[PDB]
Structures are given as C-alpha cells and as structure tokens.
Design a protein around this ligand. Structure first.
Ligand SMILES: *Cc1c(COP(=O)(O)O)cnc(C)c1O
Ligand SMILES: *Cc1c(COP(=O)(O)O)cnc(C)c1O
Ligand SMILES: O=C(Nc1cncnc1)c1ccccc1
Ligand SMILES: O=C(Nc1cncnc1)c1ccccc1
Ligand SMILES: [Cl-]
Ligand SMILES: [Cl-]
Ligand SMILES: [Cl-]
Ligand SMILES: [Cl-]
Lengths: 354, 358
C-alpha cells in the first residue's frame, strides 16, 4: 500500500514567517509549510501539508538510536515567467526508495510522493526565489519510529519533507588515505544519515589543513571516489591519448548522484569526446598532471551543480589542478546548459513543472 | 565545562506506571523517569530528572539528517540486599565520551553523568527487578540538534537517559550464525569501534537475511581472509587448543573494526587473573577455525555483550555449508564459569571494585 495525493489534507499556516530580506546561508531558512506522512501497523496514513512545526518523538525512536534514517535532496527552479520546476525528481524518488529498502523502512509510491511534494511546493510558491543562481532546496526524509530499543525492522515510520530557499569559484581539497567515507559492501551508495555524521570531524581536519573540502580516497591504489558531498569528475587526455571525461563507476562506494548522471547523459549526447565510468587513482592523476594531460577536475551535486577544483593536498604534496587555466571550458558548458534547462529557457523532459 | 549533578533538577511523575508481572520482551517497556540535559552555545544547561516523556525536535535536527547520534548500554543489578549496582559503568562513560568526540558532539564529565545516572536509577529503584537473571538496562544517548541542513558540528545537542527493566535473557542456549562475507559491518579507518547509531541501522536487513537462511544471528566477517570480528552485537571469543598445541582463549584485537565491549574486557581480565591458560588478542580467520574444528581443537565459541553476558554458538552457516561448533559438548565449562563469576560479582555475592553501588 501507499499514501495517495488525492487523500491530502491541507492545514494552512496561521503564522507566516517573514521571507528572507535583501543573506541566505544554506539550510537555515525554512518555508511556512511541510509535508507529513506516517506509517504504522495500519499502513500509510493520509499525507498532510501543514505548518512547519516540530516533531514529537518517543525517546526510544529507532531513528535516534539506530540511525534508521535517510534523506533526499533536490532543487526547484523558478524561470523568468514565474513557473517553478523540479530537476529530474523521479531519480531522487528512485534513490529514496532504494535507501528505504536498504533500511527496511516502508515502501511508498514514487509518483504519489512526487505529487505530494509538488503540492507542497505549490503551497509555498512565493518562497521560491528567482534571482540568478537561486533555487528552492527540497529535503524529503524517512525515518523509523518504533519506540523500542530492539535493533529491528520498525512497525512505524515517518516521512516528512521541508523546504529552504537558497541563494564559478574553485575549491581546495585534502586527500588523505587515512579517511574513509564508504566501503565495498557498506552503504555508501545510499543517502543515509549514518554516512554523513562521521565526515564532520574529517571536514574539520581539512579546514585545519587549509583545504576547503575532503577528497575521499579508497583502497590500496588510492582511488578518487567523491569530493565532499559531491561526485568527482576529471576531464583530461587519458593515457591511451584519447580525450575523455571520466568519473568513478557505481561499484558500491559511490553515491549515484542526479547531477552526475546528468553530466554523463549530456556529454554522451554531445558525442565529442569519450565519456567513461572508471576508477581514477592518485597515480593516474599525478602522472597526468606531470604530463600536462589534465584540463579540468570538478565535483558535481545538487549543491553547486558543477564545482571546480584548483588544488589537492595529497598528504604533504600540494598539487595544482589547472581547471581554471583551461577555461574552465567543460564546466562552463555544463553550467550554461544546466541553467538553460533548469530555468525554463529551453523546454526539456528533465524538468517537472510545479 | 560540563553539566553538574549538584544542579540536578527533580520533577516526579504525577501518576506512575504499574511495573511488569513476573512476559518481558527487551526494549518495549520503560520506567517512570528519564534524564535530560540540553547543550547549546551557552554550554551545558542543568541536567534534569523528569517523567518519561517525548522529545520535541526541530525537523531539520542534525540527529535525524546526518546521524549525529550515539548511545551506550549497561546494566544495573539488584542484589539480595535489595541494593542495586552498576557493572563497570566507567568503561561505558569512557566509551561514550570517545564516541562524542568522533561525532564532533559536546564533551562532558564522565563522573557527573555517572552521578546523574545514579540519581535516575535511585529515583526508579523499584523498577529494578530482583528475579533471577534480571536487570535494569540503562540507555544513555547523545544526539546533535542543530536546526540546519548544513553538515557540521552542531551548536545544540541533547543528552538523555532512559531505563528498561529486562527479564532473564535465557539455563544457557546456543545460537546459530550466518557467516557471509558479502555483508560488512565496519572497515579499518571507519567508525565500527564507536557505539554510533549509524553502525546499527544497516544491520537490520542483514539480520533479516540470516533468519530467512535459518540462522539466529550474524557472524561478521572482515577481509579477504575472512576474519571473525563480531557476532550480532556481541564481541567474539574462541576457546581452543591453538596451532602450537597451547590451550588459549582468543578474541580479535581492537584494530578498529571491533567495538571494545565491557564484557569482552572483563572476560579477558578475569581469564588472565585465573592465570590457568593463555589469553591473547589475535586475529581469527575462518581458515583457522575450520582446521581447528576438523582436528577437534575447538572447545567453545561464544559471544560477549551486555545483553547476554556470554552467548554460546553451536553452528555456523559458511558457504552454504553448516559448521557444527561443539561448544555445548565441551560443557560449556568456560562459558559456565564465566557466567557464574559475573553473576556472583554482579549481584554482590562477591564484593568487587567493578561494581558501582546505586
Ligand atoms: C547528495 C550526494 C551526492 C550527489 O547528489 P546529487 O543527487 O547529484 O545532488 C554525491 N555524493 C554524496 C556523498 C551525497 O551525499
Ligand atoms: C554494544 C556492542 C558490543 C558489546 O558491548 P558491551 O559493552 O560488552 O555491552 C559488541 N559489539 C557491538 C557491535 C556492540 O554494539
Ligand atoms: O546539497 C547539499 N548542501 C547544499 C545545498 N545547497 C547549497 N549548499 C549546500 C547537501 C548535500 C548532501 C548532504 C547535505 C547537504
Ligand atoms: O544490549 C543490547 N540489546 C539487548 C539487551 N538486552 C537483551 N536483548 C538485547 C544492544 C546492544 C547493542 C546495540 C543494541 C542493543
Ligand atoms: Cl537488540
Ligand atoms: Cl548504486
Ligand atoms: Cl552542507
Ligand atoms: Cl578501540
């Protein structure tokens, strides 16, 4: 069974928050409403769009003791004509259902959640900014909610969604093999709360070491997996002399990002250079930097879309990454095309109109 | 700058709950009171004892989004003298603090929290069952509580403690295990050695697989050489005559994928005090166990943990093939001896510095 949009009950807020005035730090400002659906031994209850409010949770909730939690993250963009659109939300929904199944949280209908989310965005339509490079960030969440200290499949869960309005520059990265984000056979390929908490300290260590984000290396040959909460891409002339865009394969330690998949799809479609999913090693990068074969290194994710990398501190070796002196041509093309699609400049099967 | 037990605020339930009748499934029944301490940028607030009540969380709470959550688990036992005691609670406090640092959560005084726990258990004295095999389980938690989607060191946090009466866990019955290398609990350089909630959520599906394959628990293998690391939520001990023909008790070393259990340390301490056989921390592979089994050198295999104290193992399903473990054939003398000494100590029959009186 599943909750249905047609059963939605609306409680409009009686106490609207002041909208942001002319400074937007990410993830602190929320809209007036939220979506709220509960699961229990009777199945999924009816979905509510209701005033943004606190959650009331039993102290034994499995969400708090055994990290029976997962999230999603996606943006809604408002175009010139004030039409609002979600970017490839179906893939976020596919990925939310996989997380849930990995955590034995209750299954749900992807299209019904989407419609509920759309309905929720429509209620908070005026929170969606329209200045350049601004968007509305959508945070669905599903948590187990059994009041039991037993490590087990819960018979109760909570699915809710909240929204935040959100308001080119290259970043530096610490690449230390000591630090591990995910392992083959682990759950790094799902968007689960537990994958993030442990990175806080590591991120602090990268700041202390004068870097801005973490380059997560994995395995004996130090594979480049991800950058911060982003997938990583390298544009270079490979060893076989062919020009390629490369990014690591989905072999268990990589989060299957929506932006990532989009960049692959675009480049693939262009048909101008080779586009592969393959392991990338610090050894390959060093050698390609020594031989001037690297053009652009960047990260991708809903946060920035495309984020260039100028520097990588590999232990004590400070590597200059020449992304910016090579345009950054590919990056700029990706941003340009993504902007066109996202803000309705160009009609595309990737946008879902609210 | 920690909270303080002198500042503790007491607020007694208006109407209490009727204690269970001597039917108790673990973790579904709680006592009348709980402890709560709030932290923010003005540091720790005053701790409080309050009637068991629900948490009020901002929906962006970092505890719920990025798994800023850690817990502990320790038992209190009521002796004949109706006096209740905590088993080595300082090791749990040490571990709770290390977990807190790992998750960038706020530091606190181990003795102050321990004193507040004393008071909480004191207040709920009567919930502590004295029937044989029973105890009060104590569950401290520390969760982040920043109301922002930024992945970061929170500026707010919540520390609470709830209590469960527990029935006799078992007589002692062995368990069968699923040993499948595809499922990996923790990795070197990871956080499997901290009691973080994020280590437990992904084990549900695996545990469910073990049941469909006819096992009761998971034997967590690690490496290409299939090391026996842990059993369910228990550390693993093997009693055998080793390759060199020397009788020993072995348990994997704390190389980072092992949770340093309090019973584990205690079994080690106890066994070395007896000084009657070799006690060592060494890696254990399925290759070594197989051969030991074919040669009749394995006497007992068991788990250790607060839940069980000591849990016999009698079967391992490895590579579709069932491995019989003669634990029960061999007494289990070691297990039985361990169980007895802990019991005597835990219920104050023998006086011991491991016990902290409530
Ligand atoms: C969210 C996330 C990504 C990329 O996600 P998108 O769907 O592209 O926004 C990549 N890696 C990690 C670790 C993430 O949490
Ligand atoms: C809690 C726990 C143990 C044992 O801990 P005790 O301190 O002995 O109760 C062992 N392994 C795992 C994975 C645990 O969570
Ligand atoms: O996208 C994220 N953060 C973000 C969004 N918009 C601007 N800056 C940062 C994110 C990703 C993964 C986990 C948590 C947050
Ligand atoms: O001690 C635990 N569970 C338990 C306790 N008493 C009886 N049965 C089971 C435990 C340990 C670690 C993580 C979660 C729970
Ligand atoms: Cl349990
Ligand atoms: Cl995947
Ligand atoms: Cl962030
Ligand atoms: Cl350790």
């Amino acid at each position: 069974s599943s909750f249905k949009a047609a059963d939605l009950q609306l409680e409009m807020t009686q106490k609207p928050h002041k909208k942001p005035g002319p400074p937007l730090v990410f993830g602190k400002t929320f809209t007036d409403h939220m979506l709220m659906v509960e699961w229990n031994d009777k199945g999924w209850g009816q979905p509510r769009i209701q005033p943004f409010q606190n959650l009331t949770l039993h102290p034994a909730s499995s969400s708090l003791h055994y990290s029976l939690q997962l999230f999603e993250g996606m943006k809604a963009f408002k175009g010139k004509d004030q039409q609002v659109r979600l970017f490839r939300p179906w893939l976020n929904m596919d990925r939310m259902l996989r997380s849930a199944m990995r955590l034995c949280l209750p299954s749900f209908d992807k299209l019904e959640l989407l419609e509920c989310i759309r309905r929720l965005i429509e209620v908070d339509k005026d929170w969606v900014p329209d200045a350049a490079g601004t968007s509305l960030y959508v945070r669905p969440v599903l948590i187990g909610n059994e009041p039991s200290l037993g490590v087990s499949q819960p018979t109760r869960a909570l699915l809710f969604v909240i929204l935040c309005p959100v308001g080119v520059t290259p970043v530096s990265l610490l690449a230390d093999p000591a630090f591990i984000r995910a392992w083959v056979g682990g759950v790094g390929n799902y968007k689960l709360g537990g994958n993030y908490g442990p990175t806080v300290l590591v991120q602090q260590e990268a700041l202390k070491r004068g870097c801005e984000q973490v380059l997560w290396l994995y395995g004996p040959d130090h594979q480049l997996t991800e950058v911060g909460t982003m997938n990583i891409f390298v544009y270079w002339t490979h060893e076989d002399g062919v020009l390629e865009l490369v990014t690591p394969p989905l072999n268990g330690v990589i989060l299957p990002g929506v932006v990532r998949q989009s960049l692959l799809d675009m480049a693939q479609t262009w048909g101008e250079f080779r586009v592969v999913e393959r392991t990338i090693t610090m050894k390959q990068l060093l050698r390609a930097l020594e031989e001037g074969r690297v053009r652009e290194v960047f990260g991708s994710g809903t946060a920035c879309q495309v984020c260039p990398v100028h520097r990588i501190l590999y232990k004590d070796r400070n590597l200059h990454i020449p992304t910016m002196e090579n345009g950054p041509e590919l990056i700029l093309r990706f941003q340009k095309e993504l902007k066109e699609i996202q803000y309705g400049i160009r009609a595309h099967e990737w946008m879902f109109p609210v």
